Design a protein around this ligand. Sequence first.
Ligand SMILES: [Mn+2]
Ligand SMILES: [Mn+2]
Ligand SMILES: [Mn+2]
Ligand SMILES: [Mn+2]
Lengths: 340, 339, 339, 343
Amino acid sequence: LRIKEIKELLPPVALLEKFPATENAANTVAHARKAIHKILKGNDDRLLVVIGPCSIHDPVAAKEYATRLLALREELKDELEIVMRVYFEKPRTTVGWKGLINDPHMDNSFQINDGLRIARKLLLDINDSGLPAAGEFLDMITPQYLADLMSWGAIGARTTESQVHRELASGLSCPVGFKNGTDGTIKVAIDAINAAGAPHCFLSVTKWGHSAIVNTSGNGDCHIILRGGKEPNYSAKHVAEVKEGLNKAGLPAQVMIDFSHANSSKQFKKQMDVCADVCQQIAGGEKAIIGVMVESHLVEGNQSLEPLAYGKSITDACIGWEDTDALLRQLANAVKARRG
Amino acid sequence: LRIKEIKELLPPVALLEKFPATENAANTVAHARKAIHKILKGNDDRLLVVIGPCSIHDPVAAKEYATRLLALREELKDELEIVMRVYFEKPRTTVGWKGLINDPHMDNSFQINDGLRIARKLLLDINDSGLPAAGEFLDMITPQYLADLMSWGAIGARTTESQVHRELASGLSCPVGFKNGTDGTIKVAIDAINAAGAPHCFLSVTKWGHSAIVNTSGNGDCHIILRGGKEPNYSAKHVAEVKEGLNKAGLPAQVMIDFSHANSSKQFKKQMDVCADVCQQIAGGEKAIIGVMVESHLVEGNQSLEPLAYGKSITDACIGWEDTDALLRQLANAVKARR
Amino acid sequence: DLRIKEIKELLPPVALLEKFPATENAANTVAHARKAIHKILKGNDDRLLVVIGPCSIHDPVAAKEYATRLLALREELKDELEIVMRVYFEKPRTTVGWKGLINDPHMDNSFQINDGLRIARKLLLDINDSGLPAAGEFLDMITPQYLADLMSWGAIGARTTESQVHRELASGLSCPVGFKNGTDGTIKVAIDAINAAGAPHCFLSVTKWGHSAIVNTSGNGDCHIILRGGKEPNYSAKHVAEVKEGLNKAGLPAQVMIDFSHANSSKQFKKQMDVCADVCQQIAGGEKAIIGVMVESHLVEGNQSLPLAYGKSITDACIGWEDTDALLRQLANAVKARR
Amino acid sequence: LRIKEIKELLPPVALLEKFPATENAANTVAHARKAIHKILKGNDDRLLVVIGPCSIHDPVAAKEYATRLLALREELKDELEIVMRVYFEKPRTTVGWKGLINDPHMDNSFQINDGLRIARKLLLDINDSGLPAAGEFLDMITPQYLADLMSWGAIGARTTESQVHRELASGLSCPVGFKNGTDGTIKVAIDAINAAGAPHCFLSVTKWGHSAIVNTSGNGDCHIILRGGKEPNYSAKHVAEVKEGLNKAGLPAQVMIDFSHANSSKQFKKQMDVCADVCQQIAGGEKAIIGVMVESHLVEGNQSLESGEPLAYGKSITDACIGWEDTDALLRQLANAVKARRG
Ligand SMILES: [Mn+2]
Ligand SMILES: [Mn+2]
Ligand SMILES: [Mn+2]
Ligand SMILES: [Mn+2]
């Protein structure tokens, strides 16, 4: 057999019981999800900004980052709907650290039970403070432990074509963004949007930790995320091609632009160059750009695991706080312009 | 909330107790795995052939096929290691019938518990008769119900890059084939193979239907499956590149070619052409092609979902049985030649 | 977990119900018998319920024969007797010792409980499928889910009649239940139990899926006392009179079942024939209160402490098959006379 | 089926995760269990005293009671090992309220999940303050939710002869007292102690709320509790018969004497008469009485839920209890008797 060991996993209700959502958290989640729906509908011209660390690996710095982001979110709330990237799971090209839930101690001890406790506790505190959270829904089982605290979800580029993740999205209570494929393929995401908007029936694990059959109603709050492929795809030239591609599919012509990953050619400072370009489209009148995604942290760049520096990514390189404050105002100014 | 209803699901242990493995089936799966391994390790010059319906949606028409294919398996056994495509789950481009397990009655009634019973019984019978089975591992929970009766599995083109599927593969007891991406990307498959060969720790459901933390050891019996992209990729040209690309990744230069889907340009008919070419390469001495995959049925073509025509696919179009017998012999001959 | 040495996996009830589902006949056997016993307890049938068989099942082979022999008599004496076979898989001990077939089927302290459950339900399904109803002591709180659907009548042991956990269980069983008087001979505990089991209860229990849950029961109106003796026998007309007045005072139907064995036969199997004579006279005399009896019989007579003599009890001593034939006929005549 | 409905039950881990033992709560339990073991082994001459309400029906009054009891626990600790009765499960003669866990709101809404949360939170608070807790282990599934916070347990008179309860005790991490039968029968408790001291294999539910097969090691920290029968059984005469009976069965010759229930002829103030008699036995040299049990509350007597009459605060809704004043005097008498025995 190829399975070496099987260990006990706390059931979702154990985490929900230990860390129940507070009234403030519940409100943060509810208002944030509606606000995003309004933007996706068209009843709102604000820009959805999902911004924060490539991955969370330290609750202390994540808490400090949340406090600074919250101030900006309130200050720029008339132009931006700021949601913090609180990613607990990371998809790897081959092998590597999978995130805080899978291995919180970052030493391959895989204390998943500690991971879930730490993750939910952090998620709860950020929402309770009034700051909404976004995360990638990669794993099929972890959602029951955290979904109630998520205001927006992302389906990775390596799983957007996966029926299992399209199924998951069809039952999620929050808006969902589907990234285009690693090679830059737009089709997989347009297809994913159609599929996740349709009712689904499949096997899942309940809040009680038991497998069951579930039926979903389909998720209408789904959109594409442009994150580049072999070449970047954030340009007006690409945004045009994608708007037409969505209409031809009978979907609203809307996109979220991730300034990182393939769009910045994996060099963190370039996210500022993508920002400038996108802000020109927005300020120019482009009303299809519904939101943006940015990899930001307290300190710029990154560091490897293979004692840590405070507030610096251990996964993808991020822009630092100074660039973050500036990028956010750039986006807000572009929004005030596109308005007129 | 976007969750309509939640219903009871029989735990794996319930399907295993009601439909246990017969001594035959148990040996039919074990021998086949050892054989497939033996081939991947280069201690066998035979060719793995994964052939059968795109999808199983009729145990009757399915049993007749298993019946006919089993003969050819014994007949062409010195050249070919024939394994039937017993696919219970299907990934759709957008939406559609997901397979026997998800909606066996094909009426969107989704009687999955009957689906699992029906599926494991059929799989058990085919295995009992001596014919190995293959399928695509799509779902993360269904594996516990059927895995003990699978001799080879495949990760779909749309899920080869998916970390949850590479995790699943690292813990499966049978050889696994990873299809190249829909656009034809080879790297996703090469990366999947390296990932699947390493140990993993993740969440999964046990035989008791309970989520748990699992540690796998990694699966070395993995390989790529060329299934085409924007353009077909079965020619000696693509094989040569993919052979070079594997070495770069420090992996054995071996491949499986699927004659259908993108390689046949979605024309079951064209599988015979692809067959010729592959036979030419094998006949020429190409020792890299360690296996092939063909989508066939009793009656060629395909139909869509009202009563249905018999033995005709309800998903991807397949070649009929006549072509199958000939195709299987074309391949067996090439093997003898290559030898 | 200081005093917990080990924890092992247990098959959920659905696993046993899936492997061994109840045949159409088995279900009919159970439904009719329960209905019949209900009719007798409601005083709308002058027949006598007769729970007879071994002290404990320890060999499916002998038990299947015993069952075949009894079925002949059940069909024969069917107009005066409602014969139900004692198929006891759990035995409560005074201190320690063998707890029965489910707990340790291999009778070698290997506690292969999962096997015990397979054997027990299979044997119980067989007996029922043939048309012979079954009776057993419900001792464990978790085993009922695996066998209850095949039980027509159940007993609560003298050592657990006063226990609230057993009274709750009884309140939700789908079959009639008999409560034995205390081991010291105390009647009140059984009277209190009938009243307790007749009311609705809410308590924790394990579902068919093997998960704990909150359960609400409706209450069981089909409960009655079983006179099994104490410091001395309590089967005489004098005791019967006293128990009937006791039941009336407690607002319960004045009826009883008399166990010819255990404390009433002073632990001497042969003495069961004497109790039979007495009870027969009572029934012949017009005693409508004696609604049933319980007898410990087997293929052969006696007891043997754990080769094993085939068809011989390994727990309490029983009367042989001949005395059994004589006993069942003696009872049927008495019933004929009463009527 | 006579099964009206089935509802979801939080698994033990959910309660354990929501209400984990604090360092002080875990220390209270480990120290109490060790202290009781020492008394049972005859390595300590103090008297174990399990005292408190017949049943817990109100967390507020339970905590006010625990504060007063803790003060005495600390003051008389040289003579007494005081443990509070925190009983969440009640076995009824026929039907009735089964305790806080089964029906916390005492109105037949049976909110068991809430009951479990309320019970464990109250137990954690009492243990964290340094006061150990005792309870009756009646139900087969509730133990997993609360056992880690129990320092001593009882098997009641109606279940001492039950195999499923003897099996449970054989696997419990705390010392366990077995009450004699309701009719006065001593043998069932002697057999129970012997049965519980042996390893067993049976079916139970895990902390994950799943049924499983379990193997226990046997529990050697078990003893008898004399609680009366048709006649009280606390007198020297009975204590001698029982010590001789345990000896004959090869068990330590020792007993806990419950001053209540049938030993007080169900007259709550008679517990004071039992106390006086037991104190004279202890002060006169009796060493085999290793513990006593007392039904005590803030206010004396009892009240009924079936009278519609509003509930008085700190007054039992099941068996009648002595009030606080008598409790303080009784505890001091016992400590004084122990001091006298030590001489
Ligand atoms: Mn990243
Ligand atoms: Mn296909
Ligand atoms: Mn017996
Ligand atoms: Mn009491």
